[PDB]
Amino acid sequence: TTVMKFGGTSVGSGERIRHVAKIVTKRKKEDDDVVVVVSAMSEVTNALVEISQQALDVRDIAKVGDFIKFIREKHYKAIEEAIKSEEIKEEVKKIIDSRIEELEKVLIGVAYLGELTPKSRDYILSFGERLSSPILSGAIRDLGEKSIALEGGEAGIITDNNFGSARVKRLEVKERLLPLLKEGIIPVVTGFIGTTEEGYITTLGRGGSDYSAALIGYGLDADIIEIWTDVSGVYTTDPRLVPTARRIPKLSYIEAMELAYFGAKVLHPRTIEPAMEKGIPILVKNTFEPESEGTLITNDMEMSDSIVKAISTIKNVALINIFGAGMVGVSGTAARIFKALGEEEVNVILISQGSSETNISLVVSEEDVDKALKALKREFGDKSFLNNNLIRDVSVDKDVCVISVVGAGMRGAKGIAGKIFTAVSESGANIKMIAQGSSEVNISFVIDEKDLLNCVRKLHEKFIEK
Amino acid sequence: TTVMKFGGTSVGSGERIRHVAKIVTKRKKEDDDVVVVVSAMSEVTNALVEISQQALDVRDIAKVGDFIKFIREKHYKAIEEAIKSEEIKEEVKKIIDSRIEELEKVLIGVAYLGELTPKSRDYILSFGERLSSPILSGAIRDLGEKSIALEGGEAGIITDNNFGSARVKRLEVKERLLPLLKEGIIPVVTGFIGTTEEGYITTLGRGGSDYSAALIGYGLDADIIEIWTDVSGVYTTDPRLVPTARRIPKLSYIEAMELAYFGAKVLHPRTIEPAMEKGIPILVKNTFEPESEGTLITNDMEMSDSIVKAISTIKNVALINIFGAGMVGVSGTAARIFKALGEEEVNVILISQGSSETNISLVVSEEDVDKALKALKREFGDGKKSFLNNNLIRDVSVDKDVCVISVVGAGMRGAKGIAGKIFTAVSESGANIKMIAQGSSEVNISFVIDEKDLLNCVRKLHEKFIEK
Amino acid sequence: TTVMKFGGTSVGSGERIRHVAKIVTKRKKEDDDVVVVVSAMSEVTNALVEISQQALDVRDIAKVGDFIKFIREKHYKAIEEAIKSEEIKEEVKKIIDSRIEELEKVLIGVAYLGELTPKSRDYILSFGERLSSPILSGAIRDLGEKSIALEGGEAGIITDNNFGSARVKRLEVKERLLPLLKEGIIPVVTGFIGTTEEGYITTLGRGGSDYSAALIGYGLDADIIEIWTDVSGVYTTDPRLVPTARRIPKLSYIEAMELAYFGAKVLHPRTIEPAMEKGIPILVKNTFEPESEGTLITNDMEMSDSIVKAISTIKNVALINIFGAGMVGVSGTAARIFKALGEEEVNVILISQGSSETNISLVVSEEDVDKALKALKREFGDSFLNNNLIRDVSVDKDVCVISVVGAGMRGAKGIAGKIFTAVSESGANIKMIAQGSSEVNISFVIDEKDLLNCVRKLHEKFIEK
Amino acid sequence: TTVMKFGGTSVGSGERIRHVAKIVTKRKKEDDDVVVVVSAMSEVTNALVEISQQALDVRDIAKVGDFIKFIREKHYKAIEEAIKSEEIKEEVKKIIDSRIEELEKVLIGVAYLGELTPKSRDYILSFGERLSSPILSGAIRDLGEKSIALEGGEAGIITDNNFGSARVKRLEVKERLLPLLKEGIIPVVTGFIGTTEEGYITTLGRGGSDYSAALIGYGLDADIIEIWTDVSGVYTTDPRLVPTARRIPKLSYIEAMELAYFGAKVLHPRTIEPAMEKGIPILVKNTFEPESEGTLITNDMEMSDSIVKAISTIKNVALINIFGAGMVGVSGTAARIFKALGEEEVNVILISQGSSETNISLVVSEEDVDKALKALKREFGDSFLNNNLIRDVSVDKDVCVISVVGAGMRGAKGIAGKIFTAVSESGANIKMIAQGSSEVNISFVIDEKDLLNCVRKLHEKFIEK
Ligand SMILES: Nc1ncnc2c1ncn2[C@@H]1O[C@H](COP(=O)(O)OP(=O)(O)NP(=O)(O)O)[C@@H](O)[C@H]1O
Ligand SMILES: Nc1ncnc2c1ncn2[C@@H]1O[C@H](COP(=O)(O)OP(=O)(O)NP(=O)(O)O)[C@@H](O)[C@H]1O
Ligand SMILES: Nc1ncnc2c1ncn2[C@@H]1O[C@H](COP(=O)(O)OP(=O)(O)NP(=O)(O)O)[C@@H](O)[C@H]1O
Ligand SMILES: Nc1ncnc2c1ncn2[C@@H]1O[C@H](COP(=O)(O)OP(=O)(O)NP(=O)(O)O)[C@@H](O)[C@H]1O
Ligand SMILES: N[C@@H](CC(=O)O)C(=O)O
Ligand SMILES: N[C@@H](CC(=O)O)C(=O)O
Ligand SMILES: N[C@@H](CC(=O)O)C(=O)O
Ligand SMILES: N[C@@H](CC(=O)O)C(=O)O
Ligand SMILES: [Mg+2]
Ligand SMILES: [Mg+2]
Ligand SMILES: [Mg+2]
Ligand SMILES: [Mg+2]
């Protein structure tokens, strides 16, 4: 049993989709049990996001009409450049047309009403994967192989109704997919999406097609999860930021999860958990360079001579400093802070507290800042050591980034902290926050956004290039 | 208005008590309004803690009487060696006797009942100061000046009834002391203690005689709060760990507060709060070197060339690592963690979170580990792991063989290069950093290392940043 | 300052709308300061509810089209039948046409989107009053008097945004209406709608047009609030259940409120609070029998010889019995039960608890049963040695609540005995009793099938003696 | 396997203790597996309660000394009058002396410190059973039988640390007692007490000795639990209130549990659950009339013609009326009320809600009134446009709860009518009714002064006929 997941650029044109179909069909000969997971064509999820908000805010029906045309022309072109059979192209076009009509009505409804609920937002977003998967499945059929396209819920991924990033509730993957695999059919499953218990389409979070692959692998007790992307594995850093980045042949589950979580886009952080608890290896491969060995992700852990295998960053974060009202009790005041933040579903990335004033430092997603301050005003409302006030003030610095350094044995490595932070200084970066102790393999810290490149480059020179 | 506080060693013997009385009476001829705060004689609060526990655990009444004779003879000897007047010795002796009768009555009651409530414990501990204040007062009277001994509550410190570490609710310092300063009386006030609203004696936490002084100073709008200890101010580190520790002439409120809070025993961390919010300057002085300038703590803040002015430690802490169940939401699971700990009144010193598994690192006071472990089991109900399962916490580990080291100075957080310099120094000392806190304080960086490596680490940091 | 509210049947045709405008213009000559509150025409709110559900569920645009034609034809007919002046008819028709357009757009939007939010439902429902109010207003102008139609929000009713049942947050009634009355104009204000702080149209709950009148009366410091309906005041019970029901000339504020709350449709329960707050009397009158004295509602209270002055019923309820796991602590499990139910916004009507097993009986709205069950599932999950609080839960939907009301109830000796022997003499079996928490009300639960008989028997013994 | 529990009056003197040892010794010959549970001698627990408070409030040491002499003389007399053997008397007196020594020190501690925590009370209270059990065990040994006295904790009863009314956590009975029974030993276990996990003595609540018997019975899978008291079973009401009370030969678990819970002092309410869940019969017998059949409590349930087999009362209760701020949401305001009361461990006995104002009626223990008022003010603090939940709260302590119990109560047509007309003819005025939540029980509140007359009237009507 092999699950093969392909990303947006891997299916970014018809030529590409057909290439992907050939990779799948070749694997089919080695392992007769193949499930494919597929994302939306490159950039369409982004376009779906922007048109939803345009349809909501400006409410312009010509603008929606232009989007539809672009989406139609792109997927028609894909079909024509991916499939040779007239019969198959015709049946794929029929499905794409059906989805496009459905897409159009909903977008017009949003504009008529000036209303876009999280539920409707998830539904619109689902169209990306639901437009690409019939094409890939058709292209596999065109190559003489049995195939059908399926949505994530009907493939067995059941979630709660937290539209935006629904958590997975239940898996019916074996029930839904085993009958298909037994008839020798290659199911092409939509990434990114699941289903609510009542059948409402749900998304799993941006990047979530990787997670779908792991969920389907876990559910089927798969032999391997193959992540097919546009780089040859996980690298020592984002190869788009630092050209001298190197492929890491082997990574542990925890190393990989920490890297993904702290900004390595190649893997959605939630990909690791299901594979990890069933011991299913993950292989990250390049669809544009299929002979490359990529990165194999397993339980195997080895330290490297220098301690730091990789560097990741998150840019879309803010630094929130809460000022305490003196020695008012750190556990009592944190309890109320995090109650408020939790109630509001604010995503906190990093926590530090070491202050007689009961100040606390927090990194949150930049989009969650207003929700955080909102939540904090509700909790504490609006001085003196004799009153019962816990909080004095709050400051937020949005012009900031989190940099994380990851390698086995990190926490236990003597001298590594010193080496990290003197290097950070030498790049010209000024450290606003540090987190160490809660991870076996990770050190994270905050610097000014402007210094991100110089800092990553210097860390890369010191630890990877030597 | 000047308030002078004297520590246990400063009043460690009758001779020492008189020397202290002399210091005060020399100040009364510079400032007419002098209020004294005094601690129990050296080592007696500890003795009281230990006899309390013994009266509860072994319940031997002959063993109580052995302690009563020790306290009697120590305070009698002190009266003898502090005061020259026979009338005053007789006067002070009666007060001491009356306190000893009450002490014995309660230690026996605890042995009879077999129960020691925080209320009873707070009463027992208050005897340290209620025995020393009349002796010092008597010594001041002996040097020809008016003086009476007072307890914290009747000096105007009102608290809640959280016996052990009562928080100050309310101040009546001016109401209580003004009529006495007005008549030229030097009140000798018991540090460490205050009163519940219905009159029950309460303690303010260990080391809280420094805090009493600040509360009185605040209550009086005092011109200066003088802390008289057994070192010539606040030093670059503990002079007993590092003999080459240097006196720091000047310190800002926030620097001293962070130092005290992270292990500088010279000041109880709560001392700064009331002084700072009225701008009352704190002078830390040596009773055994009264000519020394000491340390002056004010709003004045000045960066040191080598950022890092002082180094402090806490030994009596434990490192608790909470292992999360995966990506389960840090704020939500932090909310539940800190609720449980807050409910149990667990003292958390340091927090660090940076983990895809929702792990969190915690430093707590060492004696709160059982409370914390208890609180978390109630909160989370101990199973798993499954990503489909709704559990939040996978496991918990504690390491009590740990210490926290803190490094303090005006430009700390804003200073480029300092963290790397600190942590390379820490490694050069042989230590393995288990936790780091940076960001939440302007002047402080704290980290956790193995307890065995404490001295060497402090030595290396003091070498690199202070000595040169 | 007189506020006059007219119901759906009272403005249930063009002819009736003109008769109403004739009552209003007659009042204007006694009180120069008159404000009209008007409901949607009879049955249109109901039709609006069903077309919303239809637009969401099947999503047929042609069925929406058929509805727009019904709502247009209905209201065009009314304009032609209420107003003489051709100019005013054309004036009122343009207002109606603008509303229909807005209505059509939302209903198409709902069908295209496949989602009907509470915000969208409230907007759709509001069209009823927003269509009927300019027809009444135009008819008032057709009788020679100055008038304009306003919405509840623009007339000063500001609410939170709990769409469907929004709570009144703030009033600007005096501020917006006083200038209109200063010029001699008669405002015709829409009944069950308010506005959010940002101008979103909100509804006040079914029946809420009576509540608007009380709200407008309160804000204006009115001298009287007049409720015009199709019965001559509050009766000893529903005259549709019992032909021989009697008009009650006078009722106290608390008596009226308990009756309404426990099912006397003539008044929305929330009508009483604003009135009672400022001691503004409420007069309930029959538009079809205008010379009847009807019912005067004030602070005046007086016991009947036979305590028990009225009987009310609620049919659309369920009896929920929660089975405790033994002596597990009543206030603690009660805490978790009502937390869960509060969280799910479940409407509980009645609570009884008196059980060594920590059992508890609840009456809830029949439409709240699924929510309620779901909440208790989420809350409780799933020996005397484990910590389980709940054993099981049962629901009986084939149930009704009957309430008896009159001054002196709780304090009158023997009345509980007389009530329940009567109930028994009707053939009914009592499933739950509430007594103690009201000075003026006793409530109890029986099988739905015994409703009419029990009401009749109660009316026999206590009213017709 | 038989558990035999004897109450305070049953062991209220030395002659009585010896008579009890004879009943146990007779049973021993029919069933070799006998465990005895015993209470403190009559009135001793109350004496311990009063001298505790005196030691706290007045702190007179010679007054404690007078108590010690009273306790010593009583128990020395019981020893002399119960046991013939000098050697056993000597051996029991030595045990009694250790306890009295310990008891005297504790009470002197209380006066010295001027403090009495719940932990200390339980410890002091436990001395009653720890003083009588050695005497009874001595008397059993005096009659040629092997016997040892044991405390509840060491017999296998482990509780949480809720001193005063600790909940049973864990039972270890088989483990501790089975080895004793196998050697022919009759364990005499102190009723009323358990042990915290770390060894602290805990009480199970007043009346708790009955509960101990059921716990021990459940723990051993006993064939029967014998509750030996000073009446011949459970009666139709308290025979001390109504001399014409009749013994009820047979009761179901639920009938006996509801009655106990609602005031039938003969059984602690928690007695029934452990027996019920293992189907162990409870036989209630008279130690002064051992030949009477008593009352047998099992699963068997039978309706009586008059439905109402028994009337119980609770006197030490208060009626709390919480006044709501209006139509503010009952589930939501109920949520906050029961949270506050649950947090303060307030024992609520009865609940009724049925009010348009969100009023709620509550019956709580009379001792808990201040707890409840303090918690309510902590929850809510001190216009309809205001998000207020609670207007006010009044308490009435001059109140009692009356409960009527019998199989088929809830499903019986006409019974409520009959009950409440009877209440009226007693001259009582009903302040609260609870019905619905129990299959076998109807409860209501009246003025405390009307209690005797109400019970008598109910008894006349339903029992005597
Ligand atoms: N440490 C890293 N190693 C490798 N690639 C990285 C790393 N960090 C960031 N990246 C970037 O991650 C990209 C792959 O992620 P992504 O753009 O999501 O492709 P995908 O997952 O195949 N497509 P989709 O399924 O539509 O999200 C690469 O193009 C890299 O630029
Ligand atoms: N940074 C520091 N500077 C100076 N002294 C320090 C520092 N850190 C720790 N110490 C120690 O703290 C001691 C003073 O504290 P302590 O003995 O409690 O003072 P005290 O207030 O005079 N006595 P008491 O009032 O009974 O607590 C000194 O003797 C030092 O050994
Ligand atoms: N005790 C009662 N007294 C009088 N009428 C009652 C009573 N109980 C129920 N009703 C019914 O209540 C009806 C009046 O309310 P109803 O007509 O439904 O509201 P309305 O205010 O007149 N119109 P609308 O504004 O659209 O609600 C009467 O037709 C009666 O059938
Ligand atoms: N319905 C009832 N039937 C029988 N007795 C009742 C009833 N209601 C109350 N009682 C009283 O309950 C008393 C028995 O309980 P109680 O006085 O606790 O005896 P005990 O349990 O044997 N002694 P102790 O173990 O010290 O509590 C009887 O004397 C009756 O007066
Ligand atoms: N297509 C989705 C899911 C994914 O790319 O993994 C997104 O743009 O986020
Ligand atoms: N409170 C006194 C006594 C003590 O804590 O030991 C002090 O400041 O030291
Ligand atoms: N027309 C609205 C308002 C009312 O009837 O009072 C409704 O049907 O509920
Ligand atoms: N002796 C205890 C226990 C009992 O009587 O059952 C009491 O007085 O309550
Ligand atoms: Mg991706
Ligand atoms: Mg000190
Ligand atoms: Mg109506
Ligand atoms: Mg009893």
From the list C106, C112, C115, which residue is nearest A108 (CB)?
C112
Q: Residue D445 Cα, ligand 2 centroid: separation in angstroms? A: 67
Closest by CA position to A108, among listed A44, A55, A50: A55
CA–CA separation, D328 and D300 (whole Å): 46
Q: Give the angle D405-D409-D414 at the CA atoms, nearest 5°.
A: 120
Q: Which ligand is nearest to the CA of B295?
A: 2
CA–CA separation, C414 and C416 (whole Å): 6
Contact C342, C359 (CB under 8 A): no
Contact C358, C387 (CB under 8 A): no
Amino acid at A434: I
Q: Where do the H-state alpha helices sit in A148-208?
A: 173-182
From the list C327, C329, C438, which residue is nearest D354 (CB)?
C438
Tokens (6 digits) for C14 = 């063009």
Give yes or no for residue C208 CB within 6 A of ligand 7. Answer: yes
CATH number corresponding to C302-465: 3.30.2130.10
Contact A1, A221 (CB under 8 A): yes
CA–CA separation, D215 and D252 (whole Å): 19
Give yes or no for residue B206 CB within 6 A of ligand 6. Answer: yes
CA–CA separation, D157 and D270 (whole Å): 14
Phi, psi dihedrals of residue B467, rounded to the nearest 5°: -70, -65
Q: Give the angle D293-D299-D303 at the CA atoms, nearest 5°.
A: 80
Give the number of other Cβ atoms within 10 Å of residue A201's Cβ.
23
Tokens (6 digits) for D59 = 């702190």
Q: What are the residues whose beta carbon lies below 5 Å from ligand 12 (ion)? A: D 207
Among chain B, residues having any CB pair with chain D shorter than 8 Å are: 105-106, 108-115, 117, 119-120
CA–CA separation, D129 and D5 (whole Å): 12
From the list D269, D330, D435, which residue is nearest C430 (CB)?
D435
Asked if the Cβ–Cβ distance from C117 to A115 is below 8 Å, we say yes
From the list C171, C335, C437, which residue is nearest D352 (CB)?
C437
CA–CA separation, C319 and C394 (whole Å): 8
Beta bridge partners of A71: none
Mapped onto helix, strand or coil, the DSSP state of residue A395 is strand
Mutate to test the pocket of ligand 1, among A266, A292, A308, A312 (most ligand atoms within 8 A of CB): A266
Going by DSSP bridges, is the β-strand pair B393-408/B444-450 parallel, antiparallel, or unpaired? Answer: antiparallel
Closest ligand 4 atom to D209 CA = 25
CA–CA separation, D9 and D13 (whole Å): 8
Burial letters for C293-312: b for 16+ Cβ neighbours within 10 Å, e otherwise? ebbbbbeeeeeeeebbbbbb
Beta bridge partners of C360: C322
Residue C135 DSSP label: H
Neighbouring residues of C51: CB distance < 8 A, sequence distance ≥ 6 = C63, C64, C67, C107, C124
Amino acid at A155: A
- Resolution to 1 decimal, in Å? 2.3
Q: Where are the domains of chain A?
A: 1-301, 302-466
Q: Partners for C (CB, 8 Å, 3+ pairs)?
A: A, D
For tokens 């120590």, the residue is B74
C-to-D residue pairs, Cβ atoms closer than 8 angstroms = 233
What length does chain D have?
465
Q: Where do the H-state alpha helices sit in C282-414?
A: 330-343, 369-380
CA atoms A277, A278, A281, A284: torsion sign? negative
Beta bridge partners of D447: D399
Give the number of other Cβ atoms within 10 Å of residue C445's Cβ.
28
CA–CA separation, B36 and B26 (whole Å): 13
Q: Measure the N-to-C terminal CA separation of chain D; round to a whole number of Å.
A: 41
For tokens 């019995």, the residue is C321
Residue B235 DSSP label: B
CA–CA separation, A358 and A330 (whole Å): 6
CA–CA separation, B266 and B240 (whole Å): 12
Amino acid at B336: R
Beta-carbon-side half-sphere exposure of residue B115 (alpha carbons within 13 Å)? 25
Give the residue from chain A lying closest to B416, CA to CA.
A430
Give yes or no for residue B207 CB within 6 A of ligand 6. Answer: yes
CA atoms C442, C448, C453, C455: torsion sign? positive
CA atoms A115, A119, A124, A125: torsion sign? positive
Residue B270 DSSP label: G
The CA distance from D164 to the nearest CA of chain B, in Å, is 17
Report chain B's C-alpha Rg in angstroms: 24
Asked if the Cβ–Cβ distance from A434 to B434 is below 8 Å, we say no
Q: Partners for D (CB, 8 Å, 3+ pairs)?
A: B, C
Smallest CA separation from ligand 7 atom 8, residue? C45
Q: How far is CA C411 from the centre of its chain?
A: 29
Tokens (6 digits) for D262 = 């609602």
* B385: preceding bond cis by omega (within 30 degrees): yes
CA–CA separation, C413 and C417 (whole Å): 9
Q: Partners for A (CB, 8 Å, 3+ pairs)?
A: B, C
Q: Residue D263 Cα, ligand 4 centroid: separation in angstroms? A: 10
Q: Residue A49 Cα, ligand 5 centroid: separation in angstroms? A: 11
Going by DSSP bridges, is the β-strand pair A224-229/C147-150 parallel, antiparallel, or unpaired? Answer: unpaired
Phi, psi dihedrals of residue A323, rounded to the nearest 5°: -100, 125
Contact D276, D253 (CB under 8 A): yes
Beta-carbon-side half-sphere exposure of residue C194 (alpha carbons within 13 Å)? 29
Q: Give the angle C1-C3-C7 at the CA atoms, nearest 5°.
A: 170
CA–CA separation, A303 and D205 (whole Å): 62
Give the number of other Cβ atoms within 10 Å of residue C47's Cβ.
16
Cβ < 6 A, ligand 2 pocket: B 7-10, 39, 207, 209-210, 229-231, 234-235, 237-240, 264-266, 310, 312
CA–CA separation, A403 and C245 (whole Å): 80
Closest ligand 1 atom to A8 CA = 26
CA–CA separation, D322 and D348 (whole Å): 13
CA–CA separation, A246 and A230 (whole Å): 14
Asked if the Cβ–Cβ distance from B112 to D117 is below 8 Å, we say no
| DSSP string for A297-319 | EES-----SSS--EEEEEEEEEE
Q: Do chains D and C touch (3 or more CB pairs under 8 A)?
A: yes
Contact B309, B254 (CB under 8 A): no
For tokens 């310092």, the residue is B173
Phi, psi dihedrals of residue D136, rounded to the nearest 5°: -60, -40
Give the number of other Cβ atoms within 10 Å of residue C101's Cβ.
10
Closest by CA position to C258, among listed C315, C192, C314: C314
Going by DSSP bridges, is the β-strand pair A310-324/A193-196 parallel, antiparallel, or unpaired? Answer: unpaired
Q: Measure the N-to-C terminal CA separation of chain C; round to a whole number of Å.
A: 41
- What's the CA dihedral at C24, C25, C26, C31 to 10 degrees? 80
CATH number corresponding to B302-468: 3.30.2130.10
Classify residue D175 as exposed, middle or buried by CB count within 10 Å of its CB (0-12, 13-18, 19+): exposed
Closest ligand 8 atom to D205 CA = 9
The CA distance from A91 to the nearest CA of chain C, in Å, is 25
Closest by CA position to D217, among listed D159, D277, D165, D257: D277
CA–CA separation, B254 and A198 (whole Å): 57
Give the number of other Cβ atoms within 10 Å of residue B62's Cβ.
6
Closest by CA position to B312, among listed B361, B272, B363, B257: B257
Could you please state the CATH topology (level 3) that the domain comprising B1-301 is classified under. Answer: Carbamate kinase (3.40.1160)
Best residue of A59, A115, A163 to probe chain C, by most C CBs closer than 10 Å? A115
> Do A1-301 and A302-466 have matching folds?
no
CA–CA separation, C65 and C46 (whole Å): 17
Tokens (6 digits) for A275 = 């594979």
Closest by CA position to B320, among listed B372, B367, B355: B372
What was the experiment behind these coordinates?
X-ray
Q: Residue B37 Cα, ligand 10 centroid: separation in angstroms? A: 12
Mapped onto helix, strand or coil, the DSSP state of residue C301 is coil
Q: Which CATH architecture has domain A302-466?
A: 2-Layer Sandwich (3.30)
Closest by CA position to B191, among listed B130, B261, B123, B139: B130
Closest by CA position to A329, among listed A389, A394, A272, A265: A389
